[PDB]
């Protein structure tokens, strides 16, 4: 039997997939902690209810719940004229921080995650290693929105199930939600609800657009806390990211002439 032709193009069978991924990677490069923070400061000017929490160092899977509880307990104190006990931000005066706490209705909690580290310190160490070599690697940004006004926790994973299956995260967040009912109780005894935002992979074809996706979802949520934008997405991976690219470009222009490393006034 005649031998099959083996072409003198080692990668040709992957050309289409490679071209799409290269296109996507070029459209939306990685967003790290500093630009995310600038974007949050900008978002606050548009939506005063959003407190621009610092992403340095970012929360992790090991301490995001403790960080949220500290912030809410401090907000409770501020509304009662009592001392705050939580760690203070670097780029904000303590007085301005108190005013942000008094005003905020929504905590944008960005979590930086990597499969390998098993502790908070290991995670920070991994974060440092990757940063100096300029690699994303297997790291991933996640967003937890604590909507105080609606008593809603929204979990956004652009890779859908990168940390754990969505039902396992649902379970963990549901237990956390009832802890928040005791920590930050409501007059009418309305319970904190939990929403897993992503029903499938949004970030198809990319290893770097996670940061931008989180900020885009947040902005969609800020425009409409009932948004179904994740369902109205284009099917094509490339089209999704060229829409995201316009968002990114608009944001980067919007913050270009905004003050560096400083919170806006509450």
Numbering used by the authors: 136 to 401
Text from the published report:
CE clan proteases, specific hydrolases for ubiquitin-like modifications (SUMO and NEDD8) in eukaryotes, reportedly serve as bacterial effector proteins with deSUMOylase, deubiquitinase, or, even, acetyltransferase activities. Here, we characterize bacterial CE protease activities, revealing K63-linkage-specific deubiquitinases in human pathogens, such as Salmonella, Escherichia, and Shigella, as well as ubiquitin/ubiquitin-like cross-reactive enzymes in Chlamydia, Rickettsia, and Xanthomonas. Five crystal structures, including ubiquitin/ubiquitin-like complexes, explain substrate specificities and redefine relationships across the CE clan.
Interestingly, the remaining bacterial effectors SseL, ElaD, and ShiCE are Ub-specific proteases, and ChlaDUB1 and RickCE cleave both Ub- and, to a lesser extent, NEDD8-modified peptides. NEDP1 and ChlaDUB1 contain an insertion of 7 and 24 residues, respectively, in what is a short β-turn in the other structures. In contrast, ChlaDUB1 forms a helix that may serve a similar purpose in recognition of the Ub C terminus. The Ub/NEDD8 cross-reactive enzymes ChlaDUB1 and RickCE fall into their own clade.
